[PDB]
C-alpha cells in the first residue's frame, strides 16, 4: 500500500462533529489516506485539493461518464462543459431563486410546517427535512410529490453507484434504478416539452433550446440532476442544519428572535456537520503531489472538508458558533469549474424552511434521550446525517 490506512466514514457518533473531528486528525497525520471501507484514496492536504480542483486535465469528472450521469453537465469537461454549466447557471442567478422563493418555496414550507402541527412529537428528517425539497421538485415539475416519493429506494440506489464506483454491483444497482426511473423522467420531459408547459422545468426545457442544447438526453440529465441534487442532496443539508439548531437550544432561540441569522446557521453548519462525504475527481495521468504519487486513472476522493475542522481557521471547530466572522468558506459543494451549480436552491429552500418552522414552532425541541446517531450512509444515503431527528413541538 502506498498510502497510511484509515476509517473516516464508517464510524458512527451521536456526536455530530466525530466526522469533522476524523477528518482533520487524519489530515494532521497524512496528507493521502486509504480508506479501506470506503475503498479509495482520500486527499486529505488543502494544497493538494485547491491545486486538483484547478487541474481539471489531470484532475477530471470523466468517471462519470461511466455511469447514469453520463450525458449530463457533471460528466462534461472542458469547453462542453463551460458551455452547458453557463446555461444551469441561468436557472440559479439571484433573481431567479428570489422568484422561486416568492412562487414556491415560501408557501410550501408554510404548508410542509402546518401538517406537523396535530402532533405532539414528529421525525423532522422524513416529515420536514425530506419532504421540503421534495414538494419543490414536484412543483417545478408540475409533477405529484407523492409520485416523488415512491421513487426514494431508486434515488439512493442510484447515488450509490456515483460515489463508489470500483463497486460493479454498486453501479450496476445505479444503472438499474435509473432504468426503473426512466419511464418516469420521460414522462415529465414530454408533458413540459409541450408549448403550452407552465413550469420553471418548462422554461428550462424551452432555454435548454434557444441555447441549442436541448437534445432528450440533456432534458432527461437536467430532470435527473433536480431530483437527484434538488431533492435529495438539499433534505440533508436541512436535516444537518436543524440538528445543529436543536443541539444548540441558546442558538435555536436566537435564530428563531432573528431571522437574519439563518443565513449563518446554515453556513456554519455546513462547516461543523459536513452533508457531503467529499467530492470524486479521476487521475488522468501520473502525478506528484510533494512527495505522494497517483498513478492514472485512479479515482480519488478530495476531503476539502477536512479544512472545516482546521483549528488554524475555526478556532474551537467543535463548537456551533454561528457568529464567526467571516463566515467559514464552504466546502460541501466542491470546487472550481464543477462547484455545485444548484447551490442557491439549496441554501434558499434551507433558509425558508427553516424560517417556517422556528417561526410555527416556538416550542421547539429535541427529545430528550432519544440522540441522533450520525454516519456516512444515513439512510442507505450517500450523506453524512443523522438517522432522525425527533422532536416535541408544543
Ligand atoms: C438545487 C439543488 C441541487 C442541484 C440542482 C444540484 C445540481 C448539481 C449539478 C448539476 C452538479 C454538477 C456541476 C458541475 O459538474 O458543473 C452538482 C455538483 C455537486 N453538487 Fe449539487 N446540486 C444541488 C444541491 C446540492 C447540495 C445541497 C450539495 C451539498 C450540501 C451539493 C453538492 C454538490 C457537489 C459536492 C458537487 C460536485 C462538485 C465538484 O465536482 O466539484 N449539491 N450539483
Ligand atoms: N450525486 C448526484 C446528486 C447531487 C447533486 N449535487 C450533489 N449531489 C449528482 O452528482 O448529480
Redesign the pocket.
Given at each position: 500500500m502506498d498510502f497510511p490506512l484509515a476509517n473516516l466514514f464508517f464510524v458512527p457518533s451521536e456526536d455530530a462533529t466525530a466526522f469533522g473531528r476524523r477528518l482533520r486528525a487524519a489530515a494532521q497525520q497524512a496528507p493521502i489516506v486509504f480508506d479501506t471501507a470506503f475503498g479509495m484514496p482520500i486527499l486529505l492536504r488543502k494544497s493538494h485539493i485547491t491545486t486538483a480542483?484547478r487541474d481539471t486535465a489531470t484532475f477530471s469528472?470523466r468517471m462519470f461518464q461511466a455511469g447514469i450521469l453520463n450525458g449530463?453537465?457533471?460528466?462534461?469537461q472542458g469547453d462542453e462543459?463551460a458551455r452547458?454549466?453557463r446555461v444551469?447557471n441561468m436557472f440559479?442567478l439571484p433573481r431567479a431563486v428570489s422568484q422561486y422563493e416568492e412562487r414556491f418555496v415560501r408557501p410550501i414550507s408554510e404548508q410542509v410546517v402546518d401538517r406537523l402541527a396535530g402532533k405532539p412529537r414528529v421525525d423532522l428528517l422524513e416529515d420536514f427535512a425530506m419532504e421540503l425539497?421534495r414538494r419543490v421538485i414536484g412543483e417545478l415539475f408540475g409533477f405529484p410529490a407523492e409520485k416523488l416519493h415512491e421513487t426514494d429506494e431508486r434515488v439512493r440506489a442510484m447515488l450509490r453507484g456515483l460515489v463508489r464506483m470500483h463497486d460493479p454491483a454498486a453501479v450496476a444497482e445505479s444503472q438499474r434504478a435509473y432504468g426503473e426511473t426512466l419511464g418516469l423522467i420521460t414522462e415529465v420531459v414530454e408533458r413540459e416539452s409541450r408549448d403550452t408547459s407552465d413550469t420553471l422545468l418548462g422554461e428550462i426545457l424551452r432555454t435548454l433550446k434557444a441555447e441549442h442544447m436541448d437534445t432528450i438526453e440533456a432534458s432527461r440529465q437536467?430532470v435527473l440532476?433536480?431530483i437527484?441534487?434538488?431533492?435529495e442532496?438539499?433534505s440533508?443539508?436541512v436535516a444537518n442544519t436543524i440538528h445543529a439548531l436543536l443541539a444548540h437550544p441558546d442558538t435555536l432561540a436566537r435564530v428563531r428572535q432573528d431571522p437574519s441569522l439563518l443565513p449563518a446557521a446554515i453556513e456554519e453548519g455546513?462547516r461543523w456537520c459536513?452533508?457531503?462525504f467529499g467530492?470524486?475527481?479521476m487521475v488522468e495521468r501520473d502525478v506528484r503531489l510533494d512527495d505522494q504519487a497517483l498513478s492514472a486513472g485512479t479515482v480519488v476522493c478530495?476531503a476539502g472538508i477536512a479544512g472545516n475542522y482546521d483549528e488554524t481557521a475555526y478556532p474551537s471547530p467543535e463548537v456551533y458558533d454561528i457568529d464567526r466572522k467571516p463566515l467559514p468558506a464552504?466546502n460541501?459543494?466542491?470546487?472550481?469549474?464543477?462547484?455545485?451549480?444548484?447551490?442557491?436552491?439549496?441554501?434558499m429552500?434551507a433558509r425558508v424552511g427553516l424560517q417556517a418552522l422556528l417561526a410555527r414552532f416556538p416550542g421547539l425541541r429535541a427529545v430528550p434521550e432519544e440522540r441522533p446517531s450520525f454516519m456516512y450512509g444515513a439512510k442507505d444515503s450517500v450523506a453524512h446525517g443523522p438517522d432522525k431527528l425527533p422532536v416535541l413541538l408544543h
Amino acid at each position: 500500500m502506498d498510502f497510511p490506512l484509515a476509517n473516516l466514514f464508517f464510524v458512527p457518533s451521536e456526536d455530530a462533529t466525530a466526522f469533522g473531528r476524523r477528518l482533520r486528525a487524519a489530515a494532521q497525520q497524512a496528507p493521502i489516506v486509504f480508506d479501506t471501507a470506503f475503498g479509495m484514496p482520500i486527499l486529505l492536504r488543502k494544497s493538494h485539493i485547491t491545486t486538483a480542483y484547478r487541474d481539471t486535465a489531470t484532475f477530471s469528472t470523466r468517471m462519470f461518464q461511466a455511469g447514469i450521469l453520463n450525458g449530463g453537465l457533471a460528466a462534461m469537461q472542458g469547453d462542453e462543459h463551460a458551455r452547458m454549466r453557463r446555461v444551469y447557471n441561468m436557472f440559479f442567478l439571484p433573481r431567479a431563486v428570489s422568484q422561486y422563493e416568492e412562487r414556491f418555496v415560501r408557501p410550501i414550507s408554510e404548508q410542509v410546517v402546518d401538517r406537523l402541527a396535530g402532533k405532539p412529537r414528529v421525525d423532522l428528517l422524513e416529515d420536514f427535512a425530506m419532504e421540503l425539497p421534495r414538494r419543490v421538485i414536484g412543483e417545478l415539475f408540475g409533477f405529484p410529490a407523492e409520485k416523488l416519493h415512491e421513487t426514494d429506494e431508486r434515488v439512493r440506489a442510484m447515488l450509490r453507484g456515483l460515489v463508489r464506483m470500483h463497486d460493479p454491483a454498486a453501479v450496476a444497482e445505479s444503472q438499474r434504478a435509473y432504468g426503473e426511473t426512466l419511464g418516469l423522467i420521460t414522462e415529465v420531459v414530454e408533458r413540459e416539452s409541450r408549448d403550452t408547459s407552465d413550469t420553471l422545468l418548462g422554461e428550462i426545457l424551452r432555454t435548454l433550446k434557444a441555447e441549442h442544447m436541448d437534445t432528450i438526453e440533456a432534458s432527461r440529465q437536467i430532470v435527473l440532476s433536480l431530483i437527484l441534487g434538488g431533492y435529495e442532496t438539499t433534505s440533508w443539508l436541512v436535516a444537518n442544519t436543524i440538528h445543529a439548531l436543536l443541539a444548540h437550544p441558546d442558538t435555536l432561540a436566537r435564530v428563531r428572535q432573528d431571522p437574519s441569522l439563518l443565513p449563518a446557521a446554515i453556513e456554519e453548519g455546513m462547516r461543523w456537520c459536513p452533508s457531503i462525504f467529499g467530492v470524486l475527481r479521476m487521475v488522468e495521468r501520473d502525478v506528484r503531489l510533494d512527495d505522494q504519487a497517483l498513478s492514472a486513472g485512479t479515482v480519488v476522493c478530495l476531503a476539502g472538508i477536512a479544512g472545516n475542522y482546521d483549528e488554524t481557521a475555526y478556532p474551537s471547530p467543535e463548537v456551533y458558533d454561528i457568529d464567526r466572522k467571516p463566515l467559514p468558506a464552504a466546502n460541501v459543494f466542491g470546487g472550481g469549474a464543477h462547484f455545485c451549480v444548484g447551490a442557491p436552491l439549496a441554501r434558499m429552500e434551507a433558509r425558508v424552511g427553516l424560517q417556517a418552522l422556528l417561526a410555527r414552532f416556538p416550542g421547539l425541541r429535541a427529545v430528550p434521550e432519544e440522540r441522533p446517531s450520525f454516519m456516512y450512509g444515513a439512510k442507505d444515503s450517500v450523506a453524512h446525517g443523522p438517522d432522525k431527528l425527533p422532536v416535541l413541538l408544543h
